[PDB]
Design a protein around this ligand. Sequence first.
Ligand SMILES: [Zn+2]
Ligand SMILES: [Zn+2]
Ligand SMILES: [Zn+2]
Ligand SMILES: [Zn+2]
Lengths: 374, 374
Amino acid sequence: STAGKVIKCKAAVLWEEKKPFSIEEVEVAPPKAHEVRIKMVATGICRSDDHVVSGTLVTPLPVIAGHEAAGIVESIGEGVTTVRPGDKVIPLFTPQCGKCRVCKHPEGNFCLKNDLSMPRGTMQDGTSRFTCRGKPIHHFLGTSTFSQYTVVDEISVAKIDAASPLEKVCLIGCGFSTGYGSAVKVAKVTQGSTCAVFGLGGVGLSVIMGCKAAGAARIIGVDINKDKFAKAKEVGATECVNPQDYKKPIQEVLTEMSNGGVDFSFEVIGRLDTMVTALSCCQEAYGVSVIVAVTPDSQNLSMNPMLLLSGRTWKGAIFGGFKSKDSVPKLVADFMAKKFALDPLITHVLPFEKINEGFDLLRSGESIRTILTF
Amino acid sequence: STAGKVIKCKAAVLWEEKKPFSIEEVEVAPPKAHEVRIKMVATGICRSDDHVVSGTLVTPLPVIAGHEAAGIVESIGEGVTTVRPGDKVIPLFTPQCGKCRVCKHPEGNFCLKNDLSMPRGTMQDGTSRFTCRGKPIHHFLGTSTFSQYTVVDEISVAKIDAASPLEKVCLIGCGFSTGYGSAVKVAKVTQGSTCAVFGLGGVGLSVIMGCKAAGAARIIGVDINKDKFAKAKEVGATECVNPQDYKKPIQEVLTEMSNGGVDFSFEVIGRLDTMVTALSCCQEAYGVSVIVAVTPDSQNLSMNPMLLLSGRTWKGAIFGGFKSKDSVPKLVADFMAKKFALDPLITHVLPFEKINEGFDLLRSGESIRTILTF
Ligand SMILES: [Zn+2]
Ligand SMILES: [Zn+2]
Ligand SMILES: [Zn+2]
Ligand SMILES: [Zn+2]
């Protein structure tokens, strides 16, 4: 009744930069070969989506943003073997084609088929499945979750547990996995270790959860906003420090606190100065610092290579270093097995149509995570 | 006949900055508890020693420099158990006390007992064993190899094969191990991988040897001086590239050559701009770049954290990441077992008294490595 034909539905369309999202009636074309049309159930509002709005993250416009979500497959194109109609799925903004050098590399996850490096805003075949009043609308990171229905390439979708709560597990689409993975996959936090987390937002909390799951003895939360501390401690933080409370530089305070420097530090703010501070606070001989965020309007940080010569390791990653398709299902399984809680991260839930309001909450910073429901 | 009493000998003393080395008659006091007096046999002239001269590497003056050497133990102080009189040894500028957090850490080697971070220019007990005309002379990195005899703390000396050629294995004291280790221990080069080595001096060649021993399929030597290419190829380089031959930036050339970016890159020059270039040329998703050198007159490099967010790893190390005392003996064993050749690195051999001449060769750059013999 719906398969093989165009679907008329609503979607949040961004027509121009620095403009509010426009709830428009759009036409979502049927999935071609190796494609998957998905009926959205829930989608999170991530800072990256906002970067598209402010023109910070350059991608073709008009566009249907959104990359953190979960839904139900309504139909599949010819050749699709990984998912079936009715399956609960999560779109992967970072694809896993499984064929490129990166997918075949044991340490890589940034699939060369990504639309992040040089954004085209289309399906893998160079075209779009979206039209508004006969006018073509671009895709976003092969996901475009700000729509009641979306069409994604098979390499950009993962089948998850059929009994999982999509209003919660949608965070696995970006926020949670990014933070959690930075701790568990990128840094590879060891038991009894001391960790320092800069920035206690949603991703920051997820990093803490990862350090906790990894068995870190100490997890020091760092944030200039004291209101973020309670949640941080609730999710795993042993201590919380505010740089504004001190007269001496924060890396100095952290070095003293950890008697020589922390084992693992994470920068989850995307600020040039704290990235350097995060690196500097980890132990000089074996300290590991992970870059979990950087603003799209790329500016250069200033740093002394001496910090690295002593023995430190500096590394970053997208999607917490997780090979998307392989990891997402297992992360949902862990959530289903009660291995971790996602509720502490959800601070607001609004119906999809109030998308602009959800962004006001994001921009104001009073929201850890707003989830849009369909 | 010599043990327990002061030894009168010659040493190259640096009285002031930017001054030539002064061959002076000095008094080397007998080794106290857990100390070792060594009769020097050979010592290399490393750029770091020159940094002491130009005041770049700040350490107390007057001083007896030199940290890359090999010799014979003439006597030991009470409590010494690792070496005995007559033993062939190599002083360790990077100590291995085996007790501090770093020594006990599986990834650390920069022993907290080092005199590099905050130079005191003395023995571990805060005093000196050197006097020239009744005037106290400082030590250097717990080694001071520019003397016919030196006294070092037990944690700063390693016993090596009694049949090894000290005129050659002395390179294990710094140069060779630093380069070799950066490839074999820090970067952990894998078989069939593609490597890029910036700077083809002694340490640069040693990195190549490490990549070769690690089974790298491609080892691209990079240097603006073509005269360094032959030796590079001789030791393992598959290709040699000169940045002055090209119109486009070098990281671009290297990215194209390696079809997407190299697996491992090493900066062995100590230049802020090439460090960034070296990082940028390794693959974005799983590339590893190693900082093998940085000038003591620390200046900040400028870099975009985006290079790291994609998945790259940036790391540096001292003494090639080798836990000094444990590694040195095994490296000599490997040399003795013919696992690698040290001769290609030795370009000049001069008697100890012509030390200043050896530095002229170093400063002019016409020398890969000058070895001083006693
Ligand atoms: Zn996101
Ligand atoms: Zn791929
Ligand atoms: Zn040296
Ligand atoms: Zn130690």
